[PDB]
Ligand binder design. Structure first.
Ligand SMILES: O=c1cc(CO)occ1O
Ligand SMILES: O=c1cc(CO)occ1O
Ligand SMILES: [Cu+2]
Ligand SMILES: [Cu+2]
Ligand SMILES: [Cu+2]
Ligand SMILES: [Cu+2]
Ligand SMILES: [Zn+2]
Ligand SMILES: [Zn+2]
Ligand SMILES: [Zn+2]
Ligand SMILES: [Zn+2]
Ligand SMILES: [Zn+2]
Ligand SMILES: [Zn+2]
Ligand SMILES: [Zn+2]
Ligand SMILES: [Zn+2]
Ligand SMILES: [Zn+2]
Ligand SMILES: [Zn+2]
Ligand SMILES: [Zn+2]
Ligand SMILES: [Zn+2]
Ligand SMILES: [Zn+2]
Lengths: 283, 283
């Protein structure tokens, strides 16, 4: 219970500089690519085969999978600079702004801004603009540059709201069968964003656009980790709120979705990451 | 140095009936799929991006990657039945037969035979015939059944020979820059099969045909593990023959291909698996 993950808006001008700095090093070393690849692989790993569920999304493992993912990422950051932890982007507050694209998270010294229309939506500002940050496509081949198109889609013109988060925290079940996109009264499916989709998690992805808008390339954008840090935080909150509800399914769910099954591409299980405090961090 | 890995031809009927039994259980539990997925993911993970190299092939990590792969596979088998270890298919010997398709490895009680032309070359005999063993395509979706077409291609009508193996063992360097398909005088590139390709390792894949003939689906066929057990054995032999030769490169090679880099999709390094015997097994 020592690493503290902070709200992006609470970070020092130097804490942000170091976070960005460390992400570039991870990228330069070739470590960052392993994360893009891991997420892409998991997204194509259906549980079971032919199904709509995959190791990292559209099922119960969605939350514990990304928590493990973030922990790994944070440990690598820690290996470069032990002062650096994973911050979270509290999008539900940014949603209140007149124009969310003006949030400090998109400043040139931190994530950079929206995509450039005259450039096809090719982020040209910030530390990860094309020319300073390589991207890979779904095939694993270089792609030419990060793209973003804030709220351009008709389905997700706006970021999720505080109300949306609060209502989700009200659900009593972690998840419910058939443990997939159609699950009802499921905190997991709700937070993920499938109830009246796209909502919450899925909605942020859709709102950002660019690589963030699709599963196979999403992690190409560093904000992916800031997004999922908030999703993880929301889950940690839900866990304290319903301290007597536990992960589901415990058994008889698809292999890879049960409480003690390994989560492809790793051997770690949901049980292994149920208590974030045990993982060494708090929000 | 305790688990003993045997020549398929030295296995009793019971040892074979047990190996097959255990592979089916692994399959039924959903573990077997994790291996298909791991190999497919590694094959699409280029080091570096845009390059021709991958995490499991066409570069220095080819040998230590598959050794780790088999070790993990063997441990899972061991978890099901502690008396079952990974056998090896000594194709060099089978190459001497008038008709290699008559080798006991393809018996109906073990790997099953060649594909059925009428069926489009679907394997209809043995424990893994279509109907008894599911497969998946490159996309992770069910594919309908294992296929094999022994020596059907013009490039690999025959299995590699003893001479081919012996000549490879004479190579003095583990590998040589640029640590890829074009490497010359390298044991790794030679054994892999790129010198006057397709030879040795690549040749067996090509000879078997079906899913075994292509990178993204090759593990779908259980013989994949018997093949790679022999390739691993050949490397173990090379290691004793050149007691004073070590893995290459140790540094300044592409991330993931260096002596102490993690090998996607895992964190294990070539150093971690250099001594097979410290892994708990011998041939
Ligand atoms: O719920 C949804 C989420 C997303 C985001 O990728 O896209 C479409 C949806 O319907
Ligand atoms: O050298 C080769 C190796 C392989 C194996 O996949 O296929 C074709 C080749 O020419
Ligand atoms: Cu995702
Ligand atoms: Cu996501
Ligand atoms: Cu192979
Ligand atoms: Cu292969
Ligand atoms: Zn704070
Ligand atoms: Zn898919
Ligand atoms: Zn909130
Ligand atoms: Zn409750
Ligand atoms: Zn907490
Ligand atoms: Zn023997
Ligand atoms: Zn017999
Ligand atoms: Zn037999
Ligand atoms: Zn031999
Ligand atoms: Zn000869
Ligand atoms: Zn040995
Ligand atoms: Zn020598
Ligand atoms: Zn290991």
């Amino acid at each position: 219970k020592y690493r503290v993950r902070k709200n992006v808006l609470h970070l020092t001008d130097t804490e942000k500089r170091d976070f960005v700095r460390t992400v570039l090093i991870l990228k330069e070393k070739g470590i960052y690519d392993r994360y893009i690849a891991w997420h892409g692989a998991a997204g194509k790993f259906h549980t079971p085969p032919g199904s709509d569920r995959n190791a990292a999304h559209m099922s119960s493992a969605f939350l514990p999978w990304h928590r493990e993912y973030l922990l790994r990422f944070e440990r690598d950051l820690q290996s470069i600079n032990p002062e650096v932890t994973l911050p979270y982007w509290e999008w539900e507050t940014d949603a209140q702004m007149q124009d969310p694209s003006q949030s400090q998270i998109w400043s040139a010294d931190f994530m950079g801004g929206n995509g450039n229309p005259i450039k096809d939506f090719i982020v040209d500002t910030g530390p990860f603009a094309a020319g300073r940050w390589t991207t890979i496509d779904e095939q694993g081949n270089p792609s030419g540059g990060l793209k973003r198109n804030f709220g351009a889609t008709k389905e997700a013109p706006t970021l999720p709201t505080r109300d949306d988060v609060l209502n989700a925290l009200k659900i009593t079940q972690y998840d419910t069968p058939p443990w997939d996109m159609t699950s009802q009264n499921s905190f997991r499916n709700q937070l993920e964003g499938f109830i009246n989709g796209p909502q919450l998690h899925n909605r942020v992805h859709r709102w950002v656009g660019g690589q963030m808008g699709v599963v196979p390339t999403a992690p190409n954008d560093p904000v992916f980790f800031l997004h999922h840090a908030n999703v993880d935080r929301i889950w940690a909150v839900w866990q304290i709120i319903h301290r007597n509800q536990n992960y589901q399914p415990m058994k008889n769910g698809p292999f890879g979705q049960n409480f003690r099954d390994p989560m492809y591409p790793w051997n770690t299980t949901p049980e292994d990451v149920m208590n974030h405090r045990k993982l060494g961090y708090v929000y």
